[model samples]
Target: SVRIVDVREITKPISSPIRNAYIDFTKMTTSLVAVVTDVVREGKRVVGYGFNSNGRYGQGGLIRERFASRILEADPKKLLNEAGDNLDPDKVWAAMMINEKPGGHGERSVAVGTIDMAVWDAVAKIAGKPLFRLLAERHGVKANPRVFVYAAGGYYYPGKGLSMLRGEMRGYLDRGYNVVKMAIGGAPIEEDRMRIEAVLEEIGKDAQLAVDANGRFNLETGIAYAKMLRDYPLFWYEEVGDPLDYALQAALAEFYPGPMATGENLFSHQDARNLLRYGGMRPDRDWLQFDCALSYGLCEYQRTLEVLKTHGWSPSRCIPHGGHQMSLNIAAGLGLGGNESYPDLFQPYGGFPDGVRVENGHITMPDLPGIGFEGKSDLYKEMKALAE
Candidate 1:
């Protein structure tokens, strides 16, 4: 059986001069990992790469000190599947979680998730199939590689105003996105109102707008924004209050009467269960943003999906938070609502493969082994450097 021979992680900055409702991207870092195996594909050594999503800081300490060592030190046969040919991601995940207690699914989840992504990539590459296709076959579901994607940008930057924001939305529309998202709560309600109006006006009759508060409001403020937001035809009002404040989220549903989204910060199945039980999310209209890379990668995300199904939420209602390819594969493989995209943010790590374009709000997946990191030139450039 092909064995995982080595594991490595590097915390790289995706730093930018942009501010959302909660934080800026100036100091943001993400952990990128490479899971090297003895298997060779396409006349070269196969190396699977993974990286954490945005909104969370890099997990270099945990990965370099804890998770990477765990995977490398575990008995190689234990991480193999029953057929003993491919590495098992769940087993690799379990190996990383050893000696770790439950309930605090904090940054360690990110650490494990980064490695899990690389493990899955290596497994898929070894099997000589795209991860999406492999997942569909494993789950007995038909794969839909044509995934719906929305452009997520419009942060608060210095010296930026209504015109610049409007142009930004216009650019996304020009790029063939049916939906565009912007950040709010960084400015006062009146200022945000003007900004929202500017974007709405720019995309009038061509596309829809989704505004995210990034969990930056009290109950009163959330309701007040909901009142004003209800006047306009928005795609969804997202994260009106802190992610843990289920009571606040439930109250906003009464006031907004529109599709609401949250759960980007909730990192485990237990938290997802709690959100479904008390967050007052409507399966019909509300969207869940539980990003796999942030929550605990795809393994724990499957558990969260089970939680959603048990609570009457369909997998199609999930439009996860991260704008990464792993989520794109999951969206197509497991049938999610869509994946988020950054048209002009988080360079080399937040876009699709080379030659893939967003057309009519969707991009059809191309044929490539694993997560298709090699299909993207600039990103693979970075990944190649780490592998060497």
Candidate 2:
């Protein structure tokens, strides 16, 4: 049986000078965790790594105080499956949620999600295969090595005028990205429109643009923005109004006829289900951005996918929010529409493995075991340091 020998965690600031519509990245930190297992492959003990997504703060306290201790103190047999050939992620997830009631997910979701990511990573490594391959074979889905990705940048910074925004997007296009996203609702509506126009003209026929309000608008402002946004040929309009305002989302559908998206801030399958039931999101057109790292990792992500199926929505319609490698693996394995990317934001935490380049908005995953963190030198450096 695969026994967890050690579980370690560390928190580090990934602070940036940029600000989104909802929060600033100045104090943003991420919890990096390493799950060391007794299983060995080749010449070393297999270690799995995980971290919470951006926008959510580090979960060091939660991990050190509750989740990690639960796993360390639990019976190893209980954490395994009936066959006992591999570590069952579902069981581990349940172990972490012991005595914890449902609903009011908040940052506890982030804490559990961080450890859940490491559990899946450890499971994949024990099988001696890449995580995407493991997930595909387990679920009987055909894996696609080539996954679509979009460049997600363009935040609200001091003196970051339209010209600068255009240049930033042009850099992504020049790097072979075909889709780019930017932040709105930080500036005046008229000024934001001009910024959008500038980027559209700059990218010209090279790439498509997506705009994110970051849950910054109310019903009236959201509809007002939607009225003007409908005129443009945008790839999608995203996350207008607060994340829980299902009525606001339902109403926006009447004014905006394009591909709309939300649900990143929502942190549970119940919240995701509520969005589908009352959020007025169109299955055929709008996109869902429920990020696993921000929610409860792949275990709960599978539940969310099941919820989507029950609602007659295809898994391919989900384009997840976090620009992380775990989501990339999930996309390739589970037939998601695509994954987001931060070409120049959230360094060492939000990109593909080293040497993997985006060619026309898509990148092929390298055949590396686990989540491929070992392939990203800078990121691997941090994760490996936690174990050492």
Candidate 3:
């Protein structure tokens, strides 16, 4: 029998400045909250936890407080049994989903997500396997391995210029990254054009380039910008507007000669299905970038992929949005296109492991056990109390 030992929060600040409208951390601060749940058995040892980069490291105090009691009161065997019965991760996830109704006093879904991830991690470690391997073995797909990775993050200013971005792009290319994605809607259209032109000029037409707007402009402006950049050739256009704007996205997809990508913010597969079928959006158009942690965990993510497959939709690539640590294995094991690597930004913050360092523009798949992580003592020590 397994017993819950502890539940706590760990808050760590982002190393570099991250800007997202009101979330600029150049002057202010941002943090991530990791809720660690330790489980133990008479003859076995396991440690697992749920983690989220709330765009900030170590900011999960309230979530920890709210879920601490429920987690402690949970019966491990029953929890495991229920988890097994609801083999469908979404149903299992739904079973634990906190009430979001009026007057609800439970933790939000994010908190639950954090906790659930931790539990999965712990279980994987106990089984002496990566989370993907555990699931694959359970589902009879253990032989499947090999996930692709794309070099992400080219948001440097013009002062840094195309020269710097190109140099970085070259780094990824040399390292075996065939796909590279970056942002282009932050500055003026001309400025964005200059940057894209420069990068393309340096890299030539070999590598694939994906651009993200982060919903920077309306349909007209976004469409105009897409037309402007079409000359340079982009693998896909991501988040041209609110993903919920099906008509706008469909029009954008139809207007642009290139494939239009969406769905990082979309949580439910039903919505994802709508985006693909009715929205004129391709499942694998340029790239279907979805976040495993935010949208759902590995189990639901795979199910989402299956749904798309059933609908005769296949993304050119199934790139995971964030949480690179866990997503890498899942992507690799499923033989999906590629996962995102946010090296320039996340590396310095001590968010990832040294082995995860990107070369050229790609990362080597790790061969360690249990999500290929052995727990960072320094990181854990640095932010233990906040996790509490």
Candidate 4:
């Protein structure tokens, strides 16, 4: 039986001058990881690649100093599936989480998730299938490669104004996206109104506009914006208060009749459960944005989806937060509502493969093996250099 041989990680800068309501990107970094295995295809060893999504710093210290060694040191036999033909992502996840406690699922989850992504990629490769195809077969469904996507930009840049924001959104619409997202709460209600109106007018009838507060408001501010926002047609208002402030989230819903989105900051399934129980989100219209890469990876993410199911939430209502292909694979394979895209943000690490394009707010997946990292030439180059 084949086995995982090595795990390696490196921190890279994804820095930009952009800033959302809650955070900036000038010092942003991501942890890129490679899980190398004894299994071979095409005259080379099979290597699976992954990285922590944006909005989180690089996890190299946690990866190299802690999690990676768990896999590298575990019993190779135990890491395999029951049939022993391929690596079991769940087992690998368990090994990585050894000695970990239950509460405070924060940055540690990111480290485990980064490695878990690589393990799943390696598992799909060992089965000789694209990850979406493998996931669909496992879930007993026909694979639908068409996934809904939206452009998520319009950050606050130095010297940038409403005209630049309109221009940025116009670019997304020009490229065939029907839904585009912009940042809010960085400016006052009057100015934000002007910005939103500008974007809405720029998009016109061809596309819809969404705004994110990035958990930057209190109840009063949330209500004020809700009042200001309800008059206009909006896709959804996202993350209006601190992520754990369930009271604030629930209170805002009374003032805002429109849909709201959050959970990108919640890092565990337990947190997901609490959000469902107390966050006052409506399953009928509100959206969940639990990003798996920032959570505890697909292993825990599957648990979170089960929690959603128990809470009477349809999987279609879930459109994960990170602008990356792993979430895209999940969206297509698992019938998620859609995935987010940065378009011009977080280059190489947060986009579709080469030759892929957005059409009518969705993209058709190409038949590339594993998580299809190889199909993305620029990203794969870094992975290949560190690995195969």
Local accuracy of candidate 3 as per-residue lDDT tens digits, 176-241: 677787777777889878877777766675688887787666889878987897776787777888
C-alpha TM-scores of all predictions: 0.99, 0.98, 0.81, 0.99
88 Cα displacement, candidate 4 (Å): 0.4
Candidate 1 worst ten-residue window by lDDT: 1-10
lDDT of 1 by residue, 320-352 (tens): 888999999999999999999998888888699
Error of 4 at 81 (Å): 0.7
TM-score of 4: 0.99
- Superposed by TM-score, candidate 2 places the C-alpha of residue 169 at a distance from the truth, in angstroms, of 0.6
The alpha-carbon lDDT assigned to residue 276 of candidate 1 equals 98
Q: In order, what lDDT does every prediction score? A: 0.91, 0.91, 0.59, 0.91
Question: Which ranges of candidate 1 are over 4 A from the true structure?
Answer: none
Q: Least accurate stretch of 10 residues (summed lDDT) in model 2?
A: 343-352
TM-score quality measure for candidate 2: 0.98
| CA displacement after TM-score superposition, residue 99 of candidate 3 (Å) | 2.9
Candidate 4 residues 215-241, lDDT tens each?
A: 999999999999999898999999999
The stretch of ten residues in a row with the least summed lDDT in candidate 4 is 40-49
